[PDB]
Amino acid sequence: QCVNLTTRTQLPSAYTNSFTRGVYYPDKVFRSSVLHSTQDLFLPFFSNVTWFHAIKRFDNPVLPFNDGVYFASTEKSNIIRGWIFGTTLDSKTQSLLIVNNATNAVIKVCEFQFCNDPFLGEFRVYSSANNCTFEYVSQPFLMDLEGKQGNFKNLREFVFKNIDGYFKIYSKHTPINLVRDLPQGFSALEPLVDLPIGINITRFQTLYRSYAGAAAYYVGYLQPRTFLLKYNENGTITDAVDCALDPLS
Amino acid sequence: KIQDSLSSTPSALGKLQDVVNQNAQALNTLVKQLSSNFGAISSVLNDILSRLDPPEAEVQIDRLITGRLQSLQTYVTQQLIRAAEIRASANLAAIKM
Amino acid sequence: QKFNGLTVLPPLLTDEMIAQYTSALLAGTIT
Amino acid sequence: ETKCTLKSFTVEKGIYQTSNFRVQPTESIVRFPNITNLCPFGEVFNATRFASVYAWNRKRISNCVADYSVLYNSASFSTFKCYGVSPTKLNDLCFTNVYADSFVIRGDEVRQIAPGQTGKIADYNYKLPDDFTGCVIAWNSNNLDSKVGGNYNYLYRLFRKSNLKPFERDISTEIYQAGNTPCNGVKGFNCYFPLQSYGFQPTNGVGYQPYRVVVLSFELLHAPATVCGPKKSTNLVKNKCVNFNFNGLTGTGVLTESNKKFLPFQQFGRDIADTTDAVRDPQTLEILDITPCSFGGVSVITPGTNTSNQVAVLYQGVNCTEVPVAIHADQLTPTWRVYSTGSNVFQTRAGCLIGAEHVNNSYECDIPIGAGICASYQT
Amino acid sequence: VYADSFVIRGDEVRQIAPGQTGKIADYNYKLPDDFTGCVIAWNSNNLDS
Ligand SMILES: *[C@@H]1O[C@H](CO)[C@@H](O[C@@H]2O[C@H](CO)[C@@H](O[C@H]3O[C@H](CO)[C@@H](O)[C@H](O)[C@@H]3O)[C@H](O)[C@H]2NC(C)=O)[C@H](O)[C@H]1NC(C)=O
Ligand SMILES: *[C@@H]1O[C@H](CO)[C@@H](O[C@@H]2O[C@H](CO)[C@@H](O[C@H]3O[C@H](CO)[C@@H](O)[C@H](O)[C@@H]3O)[C@H](O)[C@H]2NC(C)=O)[C@H](O)[C@H]1NC(C)=O
Ligand SMILES: *[C@@H]1O[C@H](CO)[C@@H](O[C@@H]2O[C@H](CO)[C@@H](O[C@H]3O[C@H](CO)[C@@H](O)[C@H](O)[C@@H]3O)[C@H](O)[C@H]2NC(C)=O)[C@H](O)[C@H]1NC(C)=O
Ligand SMILES: *[C@@H]1O[C@H](CO)[C@@H](O[C@@H]2O[C@H](CO)[C@@H](O)[C@H](O)[C@H]2NC(C)=O)[C@H](O)[C@H]1NC(C)=O
Ligand SMILES: *[C@@H]1O[C@H](CO)[C@@H](O[C@@H]2O[C@H](CO)[C@@H](O)[C@H](O)[C@H]2NC(C)=O)[C@H](O)[C@H]1NC(C)=O
Ligand SMILES: *[C@@H]1O[C@H](CO)[C@@H](O[C@@H]2O[C@H](CO)[C@@H](O)[C@H](O)[C@H]2NC(C)=O)[C@H](O)[C@H]1NC(C)=O
Ligand SMILES: *[C@@H]1O[C@H](CO)[C@@H](O)[C@H](O)[C@H]1NC(C)=O
Ligand SMILES: *[C@@H]1O[C@H](CO)[C@@H](O)[C@H](O)[C@H]1NC(C)=O
Ligand SMILES: *[C@@H]1O[C@H](CO)[C@@H](O)[C@H](O)[C@H]1NC(C)=O
Ligand SMILES: *[C@@H]1O[C@H](CO)[C@@H](O)[C@H](O)[C@H]1NC(C)=O
Ligand SMILES: *[C@@H]1O[C@H](CO)[C@@H](O)[C@H](O)[C@H]1NC(C)=O
């Protein structure tokens, strides 16, 4: 099933500043009261991250993964549903699929024939699933956070890396109460799962299953750099400073 | 006045604070040096012992032995130089006394 | 530090005895 | 000890350092996860038909118990070269994730399977990473996969614009424009199909024969490993320094109830020296700390050798409530132990002095010990 | 000069080197870790088959 609707609905693409976001737990090691430094792919702070907002009707744009992509979500009622992965997206080359449908999240990597305008309401994301090499099912990932009834908005930061054939996912939940901008503060990400894709992916798109709600995201471009992490005495990240933002850093 | 001045600023006792800090920093780096690979496949001897058969295990240990021995020599030489300056200051203090 | 074989040793002259030296010196001077 | 250290048969009056003292471990403790089902390594090694080298299959194996001895002892394998791993300690050591990569190649390209080499399949459809760890297993299978008319289901990728990433798998069949002019359709002049077909027949000689290969891509000990061999678990004991074993973490030290809170993806706690400092039991979800049990230096206090041969002993930095536990039942680095007889014992800030008598008369410091205490050989 | 003579398979020749692992090596014939000397080997099928 596919219906191709209208156009890209103008250009709401703007810019916003990423104050202190874009860091995940680098490794599966517990450390305390140590200012550890890691040299790997992370989002720099104050990065001129691309901004979008679902102010109606809207579409999902196609963006690269040069040295991978940091993704963040400012969401309510869990509009976010996953992402689209691929390099050619025309079933000539293998592209990966993630959809968090009503039952649970399912991840499937095949030579999918992605539709020109994938939207949900309906599972209209692809027309063909010809040749497959991976298929996985689990329990749904829509873990709504504490407080309930959406008193504070949900921040669900995300990192998706493709290193030497390994696809890594990290996750975090935290409530936010800033109306439009990035909440001032620090956070990190819990690693979730490593995925064996081994396929060349250059560009992504998003899902946004459709239904009186609004939500916006950021795009951060992950880059290989050095960052200093301030672990507390409990083993959770409490502050961070760039090694390559300004002379003071 | 002297008691008041000594009770006020901390920049006066830098001479002794540095004597403490240099030793602390050097020994701290000496500890840190145990985490490096020195060209091996692991920084933990137990792992290199547990993995591999007896012959190759020792070969990787040698790389580790050479690196750690070099680190020890560097630390000892720096300590020897530091001790000489501490003794030069001690002779000056004795003459002043 | 101590767990890897890095051990610190105590000085021979304790601080109380060093204080005894300095007190004796200045008392002898002033008297 | 003093004479042997001085490498001479006369010893002058003074305090002499000798070999360090360290408490030896008493018993062995091994703690592996108590999963029981066997890993279906037969389902990969004896699988009916593998995929082509251009489309090599990847299977994940977990939640089971393996046995690599039956693989190393099998003479069928022609080449068995391992990287940072040995089959001897495989039924012991643990594994984060076990992934079986299965494919078929020609005998000449077997050398290309190792990381770092190059070739028509190495640079095009299967390359191992620069820092690859694992072990590759290969052996001829002509009698298993060859047909008199020719086996044509096996193909490899011949032309690509740029070399692939590690473990990359390219399935696209785009026609390669070997010529400068663009082309389309099924084929064209100087426009080859990217895949090239093999001609395996029983008449071929060695080197050109098909070699069935199976590879593992495991990673070790930087994650909460889940699979390892049939090594059986024992019980744990506390407050005694022993050579424990948690999921292949060989070590030695006294284990005590810790208080740190590992995240579910965290299994190990590391110190400044990048050494493990706390451990979680792979059978119950509590967390324990590891400390190296008591050790220290030994110094021997003696007067002039010609004057006498009686000596005392001092342990630097050792609280001598331990040395009663340092009974000569288990192993100890210093063999001599008769001096712990007792009532000739005294405690200093510098350690515990054993074999000397404490008095109140003060004298000039003859032999300096530490913290203001001085010993002397006197009537 | 001590001459140790014995016959094995073609594929198990690799085990004759010191420090090697295999059935023959582990069960009946291992050379010392610091072995000095050397082995001489050749096929003898047309003599002992
Ligand atoms: C969300 O996506 C899921 C995967 O994309 C999808 O899972 C699908 O579940 C159905 C029913 O469980 C499966 O259909 C088969 O179910 C059993 C499995 O043994 C068979 O006996 C049946 O005869 C039937 O063939 C689908 O196979 C499975 N999808 C895939 C790709 O395997 C969920 O249903 C989706 N949820 C919603 C609400 O759309
Ligand atoms: C590290 O985690 C610790 C446990 O989660 C946490 O300790 C907790 O600290 C709070 C406040 O610091 C305590 O709450 C009580 O604190 C004092 C008593 O010390 C009372 O006057 C307060 O009114 C309040 O009742 C918790 O009792 C305490 N819990 C535990 C188990 O220690 C630390 O604060 C955390 N440290 C960091 C740097 O994040
Ligand atoms: C993963 O997919 C990428 C996208 O296809 C691919 O990058 C592409 O590489 C080809 C060949 O290297 C380029 O083709 C052009 O190459 C040179 C420039 O170096 C031109 O002069 C030629 O005329 C030719 O048109 C593509 O331009 C390039 N595309 C992009 C978006 O980068 C990667 O190489 C793939 N990764 C691997 C490991 O194969
Ligand atoms: C997706 O949108 C495209 C618009 O580019 C639609 O393509 C046209 O489809 C009609 C048939 O309904 C053809 O007559 C046109 O020639 C097509 N245009 C082009 C440029 O190919 C397409 O129909 C839409 N998808 C679906 C499922 O309707
Ligand atoms: C990808 O899918 C295509 C479509 O089915 C496969 O092409 C078929 O392959 C079979 C088996 O070789 C042939 O019998 C068919 O004739 C092919 N279809 C066509 C239209 O030619 C292809 O094999 C698949 N590729 C992989 C790697 O699985
Ligand atoms: C040497 O060790 C003993 C015991 O191992 C220490 O004695 C402890 O002293 C504290 C404080 O006086 C008491 O709370 C403990 O109960 C004592 N232990 C026992 C087993 O009774 C002794 O203090 C240590 N020496 C030094 C210099 O610290
Ligand atoms: C971000 O980029 C936009 C245009 O790309 C520019 O207008 C804006 O000033 C930039 N902001 C920062 C903080 O660099
Ligand atoms: C494959 O089968 C043979 C006999 O059928 C058996 O000896 C061998 O052990 C099997 N492979 C594995 C990995 O067990
Ligand atoms: C190990 O055994 C205990 C009791 O025998 C059981 O409670 C536990 O679940 C077992 N471990 C696992 C990982 O299932
Ligand atoms: C030790 O005593 C002997 C006599 O018993 C004497 O010959 C020797 O010189 C003495 N050693 C020293 C160093 O004085
Ligand atoms: C030294 O004198 C004290 C009295 O203050 C006494 O308790 C102690 O036993 C004396 N020392 C010895 C070795 O008897």
Side-chain angles (χ1 to χ4, degrees):
Chain A
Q1 294 190 358
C2 278
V3 178
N4 279 337
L5 295 174
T6 72
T7 67
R8 291 186 170 184
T9 315
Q10 305 199 10
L11 308 175
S13 62
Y15 293 98
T16 314
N17 63 186
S18 63
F19 295 100
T20 46
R21 306 297 181 178
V23 184
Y24 48 82
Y25 287 177
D27 50 7
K28 309 200 209 290
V29 180
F30 179 85
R31 316 197 276 265
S32 315
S33 311
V34 293
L35 279 54
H36 164 285
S37 178
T38 187
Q39 197 278 327
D40 67 327
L41 278 56
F42 273 117
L43 172 73
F45 289 164
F46 290 165
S47 46
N48 201 341
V49 290
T50 315
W51 182 65
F52 169 72
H53 194 290
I55 297 181
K56 303 184 191 180
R57 312 173 191 157
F58 42 81
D59 278 345
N60 48 354
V62 189
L63 296 172
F65 292 104
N66 51 339
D67 301 333
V69 160
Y70 181 76
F71 192 89
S73 296
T74 49
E75 295 294 328
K76 190 63 62 79
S77 82
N78 288 317
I79 305 168
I80 199 68
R81 275 309 192 281
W83 322 276
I84 290 303
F85 302 85
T87 180
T88 65
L89 190 147
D90 67 343
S91 81
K92 196 54 169 181
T93 61
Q94 291 183 325
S95 293
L96 183 143
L97 188 153
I98 295 183
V99 63
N100 188 358
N101 66 18
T103 58
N104 56 3
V106 62
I107 297 97
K108 191 180 170 66
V109 183
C110 311
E111 293 193 300
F112 301 107
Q113 182 52 73
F114 291 164
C115 195
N116 199 296
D117 185 22
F119 84 102
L120 305 96
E122 297 96 311
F123 76 112
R124 306 174 179 178
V125 61
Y126 69 86
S127 62
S128 302
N130 171 38
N131 289 326
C132 289
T133 51
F134 183 91
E135 192 165 66
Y136 171 72
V137 289
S138 62
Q139 61 90 28
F141 203 69
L142 296 180
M143 310 304 78
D144 302 344
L145 206 54
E146 287 181 0
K148 270 316 184 197
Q149 288 85 30
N151 65 327
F152 301 143
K153 287 197 295 181
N154 186 272
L155 170 64
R156 190 181 296 105
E157 303 181 70
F158 279 148
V159 177
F160 314 131
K161 315 201 306 187
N162 185 77
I163 312 290
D164 73 318
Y166 269 133
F167 189 88
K168 304 184 174 72
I169 304 189
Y170 324 120
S171 280
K172 166 64 74 65
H173 295 105
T174 175
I176 64 159
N177 53 3
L178 187 55
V179 58
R180 302 211 43 109
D181 296 338
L182 190 71
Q184 287 279 1
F186 49 89
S187 188
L189 293 166
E190 289 81 30
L192 187 67
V193 67
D194 193 338
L195 194 62
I197 70 176
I199 69 189
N200 183 17
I201 297 171
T202 69
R203 58 183 170 91
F204 78 97
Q205 194 177 37
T206 193
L207 308 186
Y208 291 172
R209 190 266 313 172
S210 64
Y211 291 85
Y217 64 90
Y218 292 164
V219 165
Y221 277 91
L222 203 72
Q223 285 197 325
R225 270 187 178 187
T226 301
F227 303 70
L228 183 62
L229 273 175
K230 183 169 186 174
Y231 279 67
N232 67 353
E233 49 91 18
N234 275 324
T236 176
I237 297 169
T238 304
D239 267 316
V241 167
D242 286 332
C243 198
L245 187 139
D246 60 33
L248 191 154
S249 306
Chain B
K1 190 75 63 62
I2 301 299
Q3 188 188 12
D4 278 354
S5 177
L6 292 175
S7 46
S8 302
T9 180
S11 179
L13 282 70
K15 292 272 282 185
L16 312 176
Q17 192 91 39
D18 290 357
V19 175
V20 181
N21 284 138
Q22 302 223 30
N23 304 7
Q25 182 96 350
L27 188 153
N28 205 14
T29 304
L30 186 65
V31 172
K32 292 285 185 67
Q33 281 288 108
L34 289 177
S35 313
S36 300
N37 284 347
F38 285 107
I41 72 169
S42 310
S43 192
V44 181
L45 171 83
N46 296 240
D47 173 59
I48 209 59
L49 300 183
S50 61
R51 221 76 297 116
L52 291 330
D53 299 59
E56 48 271 6
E58 312 292 359
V59 187
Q60 301 116 4
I61 300 176
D62 167 59
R63 339 181 197 300
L64 279 72
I65 287 173
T66 54
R68 296 180 177 181
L69 195 62
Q70 182 176 203
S71 312
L72 271 176
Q73 284 178 22
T74 301
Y75 167 69
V76 169
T77 302
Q78 300 269 331
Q79 284 310 282
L80 282 165
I81 301 160
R82 224 175 315 252
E85 326 304 321
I86 269 286
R87 188 233 301 113
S89 181
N91 281 15
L92 173 62
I95 294 169
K96 279 214 181 208
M97 181 66 108
Chain C
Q1 303 164 4
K2 189 178 187 297
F3 292 163
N4 281 288
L6 298 173
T7 61
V8 297
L9 268 56
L12 172 64
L13 282 185
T14 74
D15 188 293
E16 202 295 309
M17 291 175 328
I18 298 169
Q20 276 200 260
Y21 290 163
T22 182
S23 171
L25 286 170
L26 68 90
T29 61
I30 62 170
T31 194
Chain D
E1 287 290 332
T2 63
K3 289 190 182 202
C4 178
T5 299
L6 299 185
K7 298 293 183 182
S8 63
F9 269 34
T10 187
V11 162
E12 303 296 341
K13 166 182 64 74
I15 189 167
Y16 298 67
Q17 274 94 330
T18 69
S19 75
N20 64 327
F21 152 70
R22 172 198 38 267
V23 173
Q24 275 275 111
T26 65
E27 67 246 36
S28 66
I29 282 181
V30 298
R31 300 294 285 187
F32 283 162
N34 60 6
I35 59 175
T36 55
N37 45 293
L38 278 73
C39 298
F41 273 78
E43 277 50 39
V44 180
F45 277 85
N46 282 328
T48 293
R49 284 311 270 201
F50 292 166
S52 198
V53 57
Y54 85 93
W56 60 258
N57 176 30
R58 171 159 287 183
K59 189 187 181 68
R60 42 137 298 170
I61 298 183
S62 67
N63 304 84
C64 58
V65 178
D67 183 3
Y68 295 89
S69 79
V70 305
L71 312 173
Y72 192 56
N73 66 8
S74 186
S76 56
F77 305 141
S78 75
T79 295
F80 182 76
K81 56 188 178 183
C82 295
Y83 322 70
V85 52
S86 290
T88 56
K89 296 299 180 178
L90 280 193
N91 300 322
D92 306 359
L93 162 81
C94 294
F95 274 50
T96 297
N97 42 53
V98 176
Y99 284 40
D101 311 344
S102 55
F103 43 71
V104 292
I105 57 164
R106 185 191 299 101
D108 280 353
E109 281 79 2
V110 169
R111 174 170 38 73
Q112 308 183 6
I113 302 300
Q117 291 81 17
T118 176
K120 288 180 174 180
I121 66 160
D123 304 341
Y124 284 116
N125 67 3
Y126 196 86
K127 67 184 289 184
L128 288 190
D130 194 10
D131 57 351
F132 168 70
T133 176
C135 186
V136 64
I137 313 165
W139 67 103
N140 187 355
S141 289
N142 187 304
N143 306 133
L144 268 290
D145 288 336
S146 189
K147 192 254 191 173
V148 64
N151 199 354
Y152 304 105
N153 63 6
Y154 291 162
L155 310 96
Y156 84 96
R157 182 164 301 277
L158 179 55
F159 302 123
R160 291 189 296 114
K161 300 298 298 184
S162 54
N163 281 3
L164 79 166
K165 301 305 293 289
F167 293 124
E168 184 74 20
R169 182 142 68 87
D170 188 26
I171 312 299
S172 180
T173 56
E174 266 295 337
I175 303 307
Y176 189 83
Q177 303 187 347
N180 290 335
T181 178
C183 64
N184 66 347
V186 293
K187 281 179 179 180
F189 184 77
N190 296 348
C191 293
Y192 275 100
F193 193 83
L195 269 65
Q196 206 269 351
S197 60
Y198 291 163
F200 299 126
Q201 299 175 357
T203 185
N204 57 9
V206 72
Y208 299 143
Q209 283 145 8
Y211 279 48
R212 172 177 305 175
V213 184
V214 54
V215 189
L216 310 184
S217 69
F218 63 90
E219 58 248 34
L220 297 166
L221 302 173
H222 56 64
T226 61
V227 172
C228 46
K231 182 67 181 294
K232 281 169 283 287
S233 47
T234 64
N235 192 12
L236 62 86
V237 70
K238 196 177 188 293
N239 306 90
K240 278 79 178 174
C241 66
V242 295
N243 49 0
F244 44 70
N245 188 358
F246 299 87
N247 310 278
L249 189 152
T250 55
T252 300
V254 63
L255 72 164
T256 303
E257 180 62 35
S258 81
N259 292 319
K260 296 183 290 294
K261 296 87 170 183
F262 286 14
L263 271 69
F265 78 95
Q266 286 174 335
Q267 185 76 356
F268 292 164
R270 292 180 180 177
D271 208 352
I272 301 299
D274 200 27
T275 183
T276 182
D277 180 40
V279 65
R280 177 167 274 203
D281 192 358
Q283 184 177 2
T284 179
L285 277 296
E286 292 180 353
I287 188 74
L288 308 167
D289 56 73
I290 292 151
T291 300
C293 70
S294 179
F295 75 98
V298 174
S299 66
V300 185
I301 293 171
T302 181
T305 316
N306 60 1
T307 289
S308 179
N309 57 353
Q310 181 170 3
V311 304
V313 175
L314 169 75
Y315 310 85
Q316 291 89 0
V318 176
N319 179 311
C320 67
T321 57
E322 173 271 339
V323 66
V325 180
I327 182 64
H328 197 201
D330 57 349
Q331 296 188 355
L332 287 175
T333 303
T335 297
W336 40 271
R337 194 211 170 290
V338 299
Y339 291 86
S340 296
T341 181
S343 300
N344 60 6
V345 64
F346 175 46
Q347 285 66 47
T348 81
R349 263 300 280 171
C352 198
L353 172 62
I354 190 167
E357 292 145 40
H358 185 258
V359 307
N360 278 352
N361 303 332
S362 66
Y363 298 97
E364 69 275 16
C365 185
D366 180 304
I367 301 169
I369 297 169
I373 302 300
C374 295
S376 65
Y377 182 75
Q378 181 266 3
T379 60
Chain E
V1 176
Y2 279 44
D4 310 340
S5 53
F6 63 91
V7 190
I8 56 153
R9 296 191 295 174
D11 60 356
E12 297 197 286
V13 170
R14 189 265 301 154
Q15 307 180 25
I16 308 303
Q20 294 288 355
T21 293
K23 293 180 173 181
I24 285 186
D26 298 344
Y27 299 128
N28 64 22
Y29 199 75
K30 65 178 72 66
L31 291 193
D33 289 5
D34 57 347
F35 170 70
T36 176
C38 64
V39 62
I40 298 84
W42 67 102
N43 191 359
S44 305
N45 183 85
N46 313 288
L47 194 145
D48 280 340
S49 193

mmCIF file of all heavy atoms in Angstrom, chain A residues 21-32:
data_model
loop_
_atom_site.group_PDB
_atom_site.id
_atom_site.type_symbol
_atom_site.label_atom_id
_atom_site.label_comp_id
_atom_site.label_asym_id
_atom_site.label_seq_id
_atom_site.Cartn_x
_atom_site.Cartn_y
_atom_site.Cartn_z
ATOM 1 N N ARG A 21 24.573 18.072 24.730
ATOM 2 C CA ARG A 21 24.008 16.771 24.391
ATOM 3 C C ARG A 21 24.917 16.044 23.403
ATOM 4 O O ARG A 21 25.789 16.640 22.766
ATOM 5 C CB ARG A 21 22.600 16.925 23.818
ATOM 6 C CG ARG A 21 21.676 17.714 24.712
ATOM 7 C CD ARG A 21 21.438 17.045 26.044
ATOM 8 N NE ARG A 21 20.525 17.835 26.859
ATOM 9 C CZ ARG A 21 20.105 17.484 28.066
ATOM 10 N NH1 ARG A 21 20.522 16.371 28.646
ATOM 11 N NH2 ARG A 21 19.251 18.273 28.711
ATOM 12 N N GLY A 22 24.688 14.738 23.266
ATOM 13 C CA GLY A 22 25.435 13.943 22.310
ATOM 14 C C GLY A 22 26.488 13.028 22.894
ATOM 15 O O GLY A 22 27.485 12.745 22.223
ATOM 16 N N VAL A 23 26.300 12.547 24.133
ATOM 17 C CA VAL A 23 27.246 11.624 24.754
ATOM 18 C C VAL A 23 26.504 10.398 25.275
ATOM 19 O O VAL A 23 25.414 10.490 25.848
ATOM 20 C CB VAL A 23 28.052 12.313 25.877
ATOM 21 C CG1 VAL A 23 29.104 11.366 26.431
ATOM 22 C CG2 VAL A 23 28.710 13.588 25.365
ATOM 23 N N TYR A 24 27.114 9.233 25.067
ATOM 24 C CA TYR A 24 26.605 7.950 25.526
ATOM 25 C C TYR A 24 27.682 7.260 26.352
ATOM 26 O O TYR A 24 28.848 7.659 26.338
ATOM 27 C CB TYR A 24 26.177 7.073 24.340
ATOM 28 C CG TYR A 24 27.201 7.008 23.231
ATOM 29 C CD1 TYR A 24 28.287 6.148 23.301
ATOM 30 C CD2 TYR A 24 27.081 7.815 22.110
ATOM 31 C CE1 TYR A 24 29.224 6.096 22.286
ATOM 32 C CE2 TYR A 24 28.010 7.770 21.092
ATOM 33 C CZ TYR A 24 29.079 6.911 21.184
ATOM 34 O OH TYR A 24 30.005 6.869 20.168
ATOM 35 N N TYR A 25 27.282 6.223 27.082
ATOM 36 C CA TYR A 25 28.250 5.428 27.837
ATOM 37 C C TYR A 25 29.203 4.725 26.881
ATOM 38 O O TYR A 25 28.778 3.824 26.148
ATOM 39 C CB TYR A 25 27.541 4.411 28.724
ATOM 40 C CG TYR A 25 26.868 5.009 29.937
ATOM 41 C CD1 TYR A 25 26.126 4.219 30.801
ATOM 42 C CD2 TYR A 25 27.004 6.353 30.240
ATOM 43 C CE1 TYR A 25 25.520 4.755 31.918
ATOM 44 C CE2 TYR A 25 26.402 6.894 31.359
ATOM 45 C CZ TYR A 25 25.662 6.094 32.192
ATOM 46 O OH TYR A 25 25.063 6.639 33.303
ATOM 47 N N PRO A 26 30.484 5.098 26.851
ATOM 48 C CA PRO A 26 31.392 4.537 25.837
ATOM 49 C C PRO A 26 31.590 3.035 25.936
ATOM 50 O O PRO A 26 31.789 2.390 24.899
ATOM 51 C CB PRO A 26 32.704 5.292 26.086
ATOM 52 C CG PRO A 26 32.626 5.710 27.517
ATOM 53 C CD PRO A 26 31.179 6.019 27.766
ATOM 54 N N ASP A 27 31.544 2.452 27.133
ATOM 55 C CA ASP A 27 31.857 1.039 27.283
ATOM 56 C C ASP A 27 31.074 0.454 28.447
ATOM 57 O O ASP A 27 30.514 1.176 29.276
ATOM 58 C CB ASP A 27 33.362 0.818 27.486
ATOM 59 C CG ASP A 27 33.943 1.700 28.577
ATOM 60 O OD1 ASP A 27 33.168 2.394 29.267
ATOM 61 O OD2 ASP A 27 35.181 1.696 28.743
ATOM 62 N N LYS A 28 31.047 -0.877 28.498
ATOM 63 C CA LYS A 28 30.336 -1.615 29.540
ATOM 64 C C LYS A 28 31.151 -1.769 30.818
ATOM 65 O O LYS A 28 31.290 -2.876 31.342
ATOM 66 C CB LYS A 28 29.931 -2.981 28.990
ATOM 67 C CG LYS A 28 29.209 -2.928 27.653
ATOM 68 C CD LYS A 28 28.421 -4.204 27.396
ATOM 69 C CE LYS A 28 28.303 -4.496 25.908
ATOM 70 N NZ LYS A 28 27.417 -3.533 25.207
ATOM 71 N N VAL A 29 31.692 -0.672 31.342
ATOM 72 C CA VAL A 29 32.575 -0.694 32.500
ATOM 73 C C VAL A 29 32.041 0.283 33.536
ATOM 74 O O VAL A 29 31.666 1.411 33.202
ATOM 75 C CB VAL A 29 34.025 -0.337 32.112
ATOM 76 C CG1 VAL A 29 34.926 -0.354 33.334
ATOM 77 C CG2 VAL A 29 34.548 -1.291 31.046
ATOM 78 N N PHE A 30 31.996 -0.154 34.788
ATOM 79 C CA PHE A 30 31.569 0.702 35.883
ATOM 80 C C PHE A 30 32.774 1.377 36.521
ATOM 81 O O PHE A 30 33.714 0.709 36.962
ATOM 82 C CB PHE A 30 30.802 -0.104 36.930
ATOM 83 C CG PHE A 30 30.342 0.707 38.105
ATOM 84 C CD1 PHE A 30 29.151 1.409 38.053
ATOM 85 C CD2 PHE A 30 31.096 0.768 39.263
ATOM 86 C CE1 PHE A 30 28.723 2.154 39.132
ATOM 87 C CE2 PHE A 30 30.671 1.511 40.344
ATOM 88 C CZ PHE A 30 29.486 2.205 40.279
ATOM 89 N N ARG A 31 32.739 2.705 36.572
ATOM 90 C CA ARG A 31 33.819 3.497 37.143
ATOM 91 C C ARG A 31 33.213 4.565 38.039
ATOM 92 O O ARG A 31 32.065 4.965 37.841
ATOM 93 C CB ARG A 31 34.686 4.131 36.049
ATOM 94 C CG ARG A 31 35.037 3.186 34.910
ATOM 95 C CD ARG A 31 36.203 3.700 34.088
ATOM 96 N NE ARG A 31 35.750 4.652 33.083
ATOM 97 C CZ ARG A 31 35.477 4.332 31.825
ATOM 98 N NH1 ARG A 31 35.656 3.102 31.372
ATOM 99 N NH2 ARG A 31 35.008 5.267 31.004
ATOM 100 N N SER A 32 33.984 5.017 39.026
ATOM 101 C CA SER A 32 33.488 5.983 39.994
ATOM 102 C C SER A 32 34.582 6.968 40.375
ATOM 103 O O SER A 32 35.749 6.599 40.527
ATOM 104 C CB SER A 32 32.961 5.289 41.251
ATOM 105 O OG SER A 32 32.147 4.184 40.907
#
